[PDB]
């Protein structure tokens, strides 16, 4: 049998579908990782600060607390591996798929985080 | 009270020699002599009776045969093959398994060894200073890039930082709580660990309660830092490893260092 | 709404590193267990799938969820049937599982992707096996056409057509399918419904089962007073299994820790069957139904219950030690994109042997022209017949030599 296939193939064929990085102002005075510039990062990328902290925790075994703008995170972490981490979080936790856009806002939507784009309005998975 | 450990395995990192089932890494002729001869000589020099040898799932009798034939020692050796190791863990998993056989202090010495330094003086040092862990460092060749990091303190001789540069973070990473205590620290770049290990009695209990050991180097000696908070209870001197420097040529083999040993030998 | 269970078995086979499990998942819904103590034991695929057609034509009808709100229909779909999928790996080493699947299977699925070479030996071998084990219902599917141009696919199709001419099986439908897009499943379902005739289900001969995955189904820290039996997730070959049967685990486990191999088989009784969502008394064969037997949770761990078989009190599965294999050797070694001639066997060497549903290491005892005896370290067994695929050590990882037949 080789008659109802071409149409299917045709149908299949038919149905087929960054300067935003902020400069991190951090001095390498260690023991505890101090990020004072993180508020700016949160602002520019339209993000809640806590999510970034959580991501950092997930990445490497750290323990600290949130302070209003500035972070006190345990560990002598730098401004290049931390930078790498930041870059990573800006390639799988900010970028979209359907349409690559600049403005992406954070919304707490119930316990797991799901962010929305300001240009179109689409729910994207924010966990990996 | 007194016992020595001999670690045996199989090569995976080296390029060529090891692919055949008949010939293992334990019996290799580098220069018309077996590789394990040196270790045997060292043991003889040291004078010990009870020595237990550990072996993986592969080769069960060949090693025994090697031990028997050709070779001076005249000691009682005991060889065992547990069936839990999968190569992907090397000796930590063996150590965890074998614990009731241990009576006192134990010496750890793998098969991959080339030695020229005096033997008994390490043991004596271990005995005297009364500490948990002891390791040695030897320089790289001077005769005609990033390698691995070490730190030294001397006035007592102690180790502070021993983390390798495999998954290295681009800037230097230490701790100030470990730096404010012991204000003077010297950064070592040329020195390399030569697999010499000495251990005490107060380590047997911690292995069963909390398994954390990796590669016999990554987290075998690295949990020692009693700083900032301290939550884990110690078993009953502060938990600190020691490090001593040596001048003479005695080195390890793991990566691209097999053809150089031959050169060193033939002069 | 009360739902009926599976009666017809559909099997999906292809080639290694192409994707079959994913495809199965896409077809059905829920993620499979295979690939420390739970889930993993041996490479397989199990998930529940629903046949509910809404008629108020073309291709689009079927949906993943029981509640239908996607094309434009407010009402419920009519009762047709139910299916449970058994996925077998398309490896040269892993052939035993495929063979096992074959005897069970009523519907077959073949997969060819547009990235590798046109002539394929493994697929041909599979086809031959199918032909041998009394089967006619074969369906051809195309794996990936996403990065393909326009004419290449056509060329591939032509090549396929050219290939399938001098074979027993001829009545075969061809469908282009996707795995990641979550579309083009309704059409597949329709094809499954229409083309294949209702297979006269029957229960006789000798009921047989094949446990691929072992489970300890309990909450982390279960109390003494309330304990559940060890669930053995196994695909039933033939014969309807019901509540109230005496089961044996055939191969036998090494209990001495000198080492003896000769031991009596372990007996167990059924407690409860797990299928779809709601509990059922009977079990119609043709799916990996979780059979809850009186086995300890310590036994059902990882690398011990790899492809161990389950049978009724007195049957023919049977225990084995060195195993009896009659091998047929090929001319030259196949797999490399360097080629070497096949050498004669050498005494005392570690080689991997795959019979029935097992993937375990073995040692060579005797050297002969056609027959071979091998000693097993970890449990292994055989069903009714089923072929053997041998894998030998040449360079680092395991390599194929040829196919074989069991004389028992």
Domain annotation for chain C: domains and CATH numbers:
5-201 (3.40.50.300), 202-316 (2.40.30.10), 317-408 (2.40.30.10)
Residues of A in contact with C186 (CB under 8 A): none
Query: What is d(CA B252, CA B261) in angstroms, rounded to the nearest whole number?
Result: 10
Q: Identify the closest residue of chain C to B22 by CA–CA distance.
A: C349
Q: How far apart are CA C8 and CA C375, in angstroms?
A: 38
Question: Do A91 and A73 touch, CB atoms closer than 8 A?
Answer: no
CA distance B6 to B107: 9
Query: What are the φ/ψ torsions at residue B14 (nearest 5 degrees)?
Result: -70, 150
Rounded distance, CA A120 to CA A112, Å?
A: 21
Contacts of A65-74 with CB under 8 Å at 24 or more apart are: A69/A36, A69/A38, A69/A39, A70/A34, A70/A35, A70/A36, A70/A38, A70/A39, A71/A33, A71/A34, A71/A35, A71/A36, A71/A38, A72/A32, A72/A34, A73/A32, A73/A33, A73/A34, A73/A35, A74/A32, A74/A33
CB contact under 8 A, A1 and C187: no
Give the sign of the dihedral formed by CA B203, CA B207, CA B211, CA B214.
Answer: positive
Backbone angles phi, psi at C87, to 5 degrees: -105, 130
Distance CA C400, CA C392 (A): 7
Residues 6+ apart with CB under 8 A from C256: none
The number of angstroms, rounded, from the C-alpha of C181 to the middle of its chain's C-alpha atoms is 25
Q: Contact A31/A41 with Cβ under 8 angstroms?
A: no
Q: Tokens 């009576």 correspond to what residue?
A: B103
**H or E segment at B3?**
strand B2-7
Indicate the angle between helix axes A81-88 and A49-59, nearest 10 degrees: 110
Please, which chains are in contact with C (at least 3 CB pairs closer than 8 A)? A, B
Q: Is B21 on the interface with C (CB under 8 A)?
A: yes
In the three-class reduction of DSSP (H, G, I as helix; E, B as strand; rest coil), residue B39 is classed as helix
Based on the number of CB atoms within 10 Å of its own CB, is C85 exposed (0-12), middle (13-18) or buried (19 or more)?
buried
Output the six-digit token pair for C301. 């761990």
The secondary structure of chain C, three-state, reads CCCCCCCCCEEEECCCCCCCHHHHHHHHCCCCCCCCCCCCCCCCEEEEEEEEECCCCCCCCCCCCCCCCCCCCCCCCEEEEEEEEEECCCCCCCCHHHHHHHHHCCEEEEEECCCCCCCCHHHHHHHHHHHHCCCCCEEEEECCCCCCCCHHHHHHHHHHHHHCCCCCCCCCCEEECCCCCCCCCHHHHHHHHHHCCCCCCCCCCCCEEEEEEECCCCCCCCCCCCCCCEEEEEEEEECCEECCCEEEECCCCCCCCCCCCCCCCEEEEEEEEECCCCCCCEECCCCEEEEEECCCCCCCCCCCCCCCEEEECCCCCEECCCCEEEECCCCECCCCCCCCECCCCCCCCEEEEEECCCCEEEEECCCCCCEEEEEECCCCEECCCCCEEEEEEEECEEEEEEEEEECC
Give the residue carrying structure tokens 């064969």: C285
- Other CB atoms within 10 Å distance of the CB of residue C166: 5
Contacts of C197 (CB under 8 A, 6+ apart): none
Domain count, chain B: 1
Packing angle, helices C121-132 and C96-104, rounded to 10:
40
**Chain B interface, best mutation among A76, A81, A83, A85, by max B CB count within 10 A:** A76
Task: Tell me the residue range of the domain where B256 lies.
Answer: 1-267
Residues of A in contact with C172 (CB under 8 A): 1
Quick one: C266 exposed, middle or buried, by C-beta within 10 A (0-12, 13-18, 19+)?
middle
Q: Beta-carbon neighbour count of residue B44 at 10 Å? A: 14
Closest by Cα among A97, A91, A99, A106 to A45: A106
Q: C361 to chain A, minimum CA–CA distance in Å?
A: 38
- Nearest Cα to Cα of residue B96 among B189, B230, B216: B216
Nearest by CB to residue C145, choosing from A1, A2, A12, is: A12
Between CA C287 and CA C197 the distance in angstroms is: 19
Minimal Cα distance from B18: which residue of C?
C396
Q: Do the chains contact at B171 and A78, CB–CB below 8 Å?
A: yes
Residues facing residue B153 across a β-bridge: B158
Q: How far apart are CA B93 and CA C336, in angstroms?
A: 37
Nearest Cα residue in chain B from C351: B21
- Cβ pair C205, C238 in contact under 8 A: yes
CA distance C229 to C311: 18
Query: If you count them, how many residues does chain B have?
Result: 267
What is the longest distance spanned by two Cα atoms in chain C?
72
CA–CA dist C182, C239 (Å, integer): 35
Contact A81 B169 (CB under 8 A): yes
Residue carrying the six token digits 């000691």 = B75
Return d(Cα C293, Cα C234) in angstroms, integer: 11
Q: C98: number of CA atoms within 13 Å, CB side?
A: 28
Q: Which two tokens stand for residue B165?
A: 């540069």
**How many Cβ atoms are within 10 Å of B1's Cβ, its own excluded?**
7
Residue to substitute from A2, A8, A15, interface C, most C β-carbons within 10 A: A8
Q: How far apart are CA C128 and CA C169, in angstroms?
A: 10
Which of C100, C62, C75 shows the shortest CA–CA distance to C210? C100
DSSP-derived secondary structure for B170-239: SS----SHHHHSS---EEESSEEE---EEE-STTHHHHHH-----TTTTSSS-TT---TT--SPPP----
State residue B259 phi and psi, 5-degree precision: -80, -20
> Which among A1, A8, A16 has CB closest to C176?
A8
Q: After which residues is chain A broken (C to N over 2.5 A)?
A: 17, 68, 109
**Close Cβ partners of C28 (under 8 Å, ≥ 6 residues apart):** C47, C48, C49, C85
Chain A to chain B Cβ contacts (< 8 Å): 25
| Dihedral sign computed on CA atoms, order B7, B10, B13, B16 | positive
Residue with tokens 């040692």: C363
DSSP string for residues in chain A: --STTHHHHHHHHHS-----PPP-------SEEEESSHHHHHHHTT--HHHHHHHHHHHS---EEEE--EEEEEB---SSHHHHHHHHTTTSSS--SSS--S-EE------S-EEEESSS--EEE---
- The alpha carbon of residue A77 is apart from the nearest alpha carbon of chain B, in Å, by 7
- Quote the tokens at residue C86: 């058994």
CB contact (8 A) between residue C176 and residue A15: no
* Beta-bridge partners for C146: none
Chain position carrying tokens 């629903």:
C50
The per-residue b/e assignment along B216-233, b for 16 or more CB within 10 angstroms, e otherwise, is bbeebbbeeeeeeeeeee
Phi/psi class of residue B79: alpha, beta or left (left: φ > 0; alpha: ψ in -120 to 50)?
Answer: beta
Alpha carbons C168 and B224: distance in angstroms, whole number: 71
CA nearest B167 in A: which residue? A81
Q: Which of C172, C176, C183 sits opposite A9 (nearest CB)?
A: C176
* R_g over Cα of chain B: 19
- Write out the H or E segment, with its range, that includes residue B246: strand B241-246
In the structure encoding, which two tokens stand for residue B85, read together? 């190791």
Q: How far apart are CA C294 and CA C270, in angstroms?
A: 6
Q: How far is CA A29 from the centre of its chain?
A: 26
Is C153 within any annotated ligand binding site? no
Give the DSSP per-residue string, B132-169: SEEEEEEEPP--------EEEE----EE-----SSS--
DSSP single-letter state for residue B245: E
Q: Answer whether B133's CB lies under 8 Å from B242's CB.
A: yes
* CB-CB contact of C143 with C14 (8 Å): yes
Residue C22, judged by CB atoms within 10 A of its CB (0-12, 13-18, 19+), counts as middle
Q: In whole angstroms, what is the distance from residue C287 CA to residue C306 CA? A: 18
C126 is in an annotated binding site: no
Q: Which long-range contacts (CB under 8 A, 24 or more apart) does C399-402 make?
A: C399/C333, C399/C335, C400/C92, C400/C93, C400/C333, C400/C334, C400/C335, C401/C327, C401/C329, C401/C330, C401/C333, C401/C342, C402/C327, C402/C328, C402/C329, C402/C330, C402/C342
End-to-end CA distance of chain B: 42
Q: Are strands C246-249 and C309-312 parallel, antiparallel or unpaired?
A: antiparallel
- Under 8 Å between Cβ of C334 and C400: yes
Q: What is the resolution of this structure in A?
A: 10.1
Q: Distance (Å, rounded) from C-alpha B117 to C-alpha B248? A: 7
Q: What span, in angstroms and rounded, lies between the C-alpha atoms of C382 and C368? A: 22
Reading the block at residue C251, the tokens are 């191969």
String of b and e for C237-249 (b: at least 16 CB within 10 Å)?
bbbebeeeeebbb
Q: How far is A31 from chain B (nearest CA, A)?
A: 5
CB pair distance less than 8 Å for B58 and C349:
no
Q: Tell me: is residue C21 an annotated ligand-binding position.
A: yes
Residue C144 annotated as lining a ligand binding site: yes
Contact C100, C383 (CB under 8 A): yes
User: CA-CA distance, C256 to B83, in Å (whole number)?
Assistant: 13
C339 by Cβ neighbours in 10 Å (0-12 / 13-18 / 19+) ranks as: exposed
CB-count burial class (<10 Å; 0-12, 13-18, 19+) for C388: buried
Nearest to B251 by CA among B265, B241, B261, B243: B261
Tell me which residue of C253, C292, C288 sits closest to C273, measured CA to CA.
C292
Cβ atoms within 10 Å of C194's Cβ, excluding its own:
9
Residue closest to C93 by CA, chosen among C302, C361, C370 = C361
**Which tokens belong to B154?**
């001397």
Residue reference for tokens 């080195």: B251
Whether C349 and B21 lie within 8 Å, measured CB to CB: yes
First to last CA, chain C: 47
> What residues have CB less than 8 Å from C403, skipping those under 6 apart?
C95, C125, C327, C328, C387, C388, C389
Inter-chain touch A76–B169, beta carbons under 8 Å? no
Residue C196, CB-side half-sphere exposure with 13 Å CA sphere: 22
Q: Give the contacts of C398 (CB within 8 A, at least 6 positions apart).
A: C93, C352, C391, C392
Torsions phi, psi of B260, nearest 5?
Answer: -75, -35
Residues of B within an 8 Å Cβ radius of A:
169-171, 173-177
**Contact of B66 with B28, CB cutoff 8 Å:** no
* Disruptive mutation site among C145, C155, C172 for chain A (greatest number of A CBs within 10 Å): C145
- Which string of b and e fits C299-311 if b means at least 16 CB within 10 Å? bbeeeebbbbbbb
Taking the mean position of all CA atoms in its chain, how far away is CA C45?
A: 7
Which DSSP string corresponds to B77-140?
EEEE--S-------SHHHHHH--TT--SEEEEEES-----S-SHHHHHHHHHHT-SEEEEEEEP
């Amino acid at each position: 049998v080789g008659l109802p296939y071409s149409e299917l193939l045709s149908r299949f064929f038919n149905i087929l579908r960054k300067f935003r990085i902020p400069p991190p102002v951090c001095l390498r005075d260690g023991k505890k990782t101090i990020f004072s510039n993180i508020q700016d990062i949160a602002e520019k990328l339209h993000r809640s600060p806590e999510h970034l902290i959580q991501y950092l925790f997930a990445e490497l075994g750290t323990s600290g607390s949130v302070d209003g703008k500035r972070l006190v995170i345990k560990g002598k972490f730098q401004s290049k591996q931390m930078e790498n981490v930041l870059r990573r979080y800006i390639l799988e936790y900010v970028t979209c798929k359907t349409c690559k856009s600049i403005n992406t806002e954070l919304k707490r939507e119930n316990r797991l985080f799901f962010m929305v784009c300001k240009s179109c309005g689409s729910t994207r998975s924010v966990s990996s | 009270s007194i016992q020595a450990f001999v670690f045996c395995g199989k090569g995976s990192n080296l390029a060529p020699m090891q692919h055949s089932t008949r010939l293992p890494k334990a019996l290799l002729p580098i220069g018309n002599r077996p590789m394990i001869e040196y270790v045997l000589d060292w043991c003889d020099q040291a004078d010990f009776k009870e020595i237990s040898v550990v072996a993986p799932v592969d080769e069960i009798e060949l090693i025994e045969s090697g031990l028997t034939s050709f070779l001076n020692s005249n000691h009682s050796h005991h060889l065992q093959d547990p069936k839990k190791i999968n190569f992907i863990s090397t000796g930590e998993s063996l150590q965890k398994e074998l614990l009731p056989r241990i009576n006192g202090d134990f010496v750890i010495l793998p098969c991959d060894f080339v030695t020229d330094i005096p033997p008994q003086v390490l043991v004596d040092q271990f005995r005297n200073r009364d500490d948990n862990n002891l390791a040695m460092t030897i320089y790289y060749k001077n005769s005609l890039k990033q390698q691995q990091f070490f730190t030294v303190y001397s006035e007592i001789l102690l180790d502070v930082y021993s983390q390798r540069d495999v998954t290295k973070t681009k800037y230097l990473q230490i701790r100030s709580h470990l730096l404010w205590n012991y204000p003077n620290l010297t950064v070592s770049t040329k020195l390399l660990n030569s697999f010499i290990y000495f251990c005490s009695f107060e380590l047997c209990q911690l292995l069963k309660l909390g398994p954390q050991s990796m590669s016999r180097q990554a987290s075998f000696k690295d949990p020692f830092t009693g700083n900032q908070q301290q939550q884990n209870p110690p078993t009953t001197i502060f938990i600190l490893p020691n490090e001593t420097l040596f001048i003479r040529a005695n080195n390890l083999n793991a990566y691209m260092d097999a053809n150089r040993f031959v050169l060193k030998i033939k002069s | 709404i009360i739902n009926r269970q599976a009666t017809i078995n559909i099997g999906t086979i292809g080639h290694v590193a192409h994707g079959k499990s994913t495809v199965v998942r896409a077809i059905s819904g829920v993620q499979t267990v295979r690939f420390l103590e739970r889930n993993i034991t041996i490479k397989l695929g199990y998930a529940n799938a629903k046949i509910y057609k809404c008629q108020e034509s073309f291709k689009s009808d079927k949906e993943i969820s029981p509640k239908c709100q996607r094309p434009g229909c407010p009402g419920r779909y009519k009762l047709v049937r139910h299916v449970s999928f058994v996925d077998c790996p398309g490896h040269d080493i892993l052939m035993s599982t495929m063979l096992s699947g074959a005897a069970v299977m009523d519907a077959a699925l073949l997969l060819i992707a547009g990235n590798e070479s046109c002539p394929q030996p493994q697929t041909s071998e599979h086809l031959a096996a199918i032909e041998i084990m009394k089967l006619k219902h074969v369906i051809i599917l195309q794996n990936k056409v996403d990065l393909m141009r326009e004419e290449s696919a056509l060329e591939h199709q032509k090549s396929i057509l050219k290939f399938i001419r001098g074979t027993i099986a001829d009545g075969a439908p061809i469908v282009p399918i996707s795995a990641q897009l979550k579309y083009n499943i309704d059409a597949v379902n329709e094809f499954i419904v229409k083309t294949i005739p209702v297979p006269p289900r029957d229960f006789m001969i000798s009921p047989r089962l094949i446990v691929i995955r072992s489970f300890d189904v309990n909450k982390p820290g279960a109390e003494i007073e309330d304990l559940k039996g060890g669930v053995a997730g196994g695909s039933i070959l033939n014969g309807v299994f019901k509540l109230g049967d005496e089961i044996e685990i055939r191969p036998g486990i090494v209990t001495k820790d000198k080492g003896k191999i000769q031991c009596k088989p372990i007996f167990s009784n059924i407690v409860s069957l797990f299928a779809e969502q709601n509990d059922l008394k009977f079990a119609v064969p043709g799916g990996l139904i979780g059979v809850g037997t009186k086995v300890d949770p310590t036994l059902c761990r990882a690398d011990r219950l790899v492809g161990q078989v389950v049978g009724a009190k007195g049957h023919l599965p049977n225990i084995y030690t060195d195993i009896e294999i009659n091998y047929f050797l090929l001319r030259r070694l196949l797999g490399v994109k360097k080629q070497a001639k096949v050498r004669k066997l050498e005494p005392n060497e570690v080689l991997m042997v795959n019979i029935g549903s097992t993937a375990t290491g073995a040692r060579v005892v005797a050297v002969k022209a056609d027959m071979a005896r091998l000693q097993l370290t970890s449990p292994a067994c055989t069903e009714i017949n089923e072929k053997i695929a041998l894998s030998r050590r040449i360079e680092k990882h395991w390599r194929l030599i040829g196919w074989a037949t069991i004389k028992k």
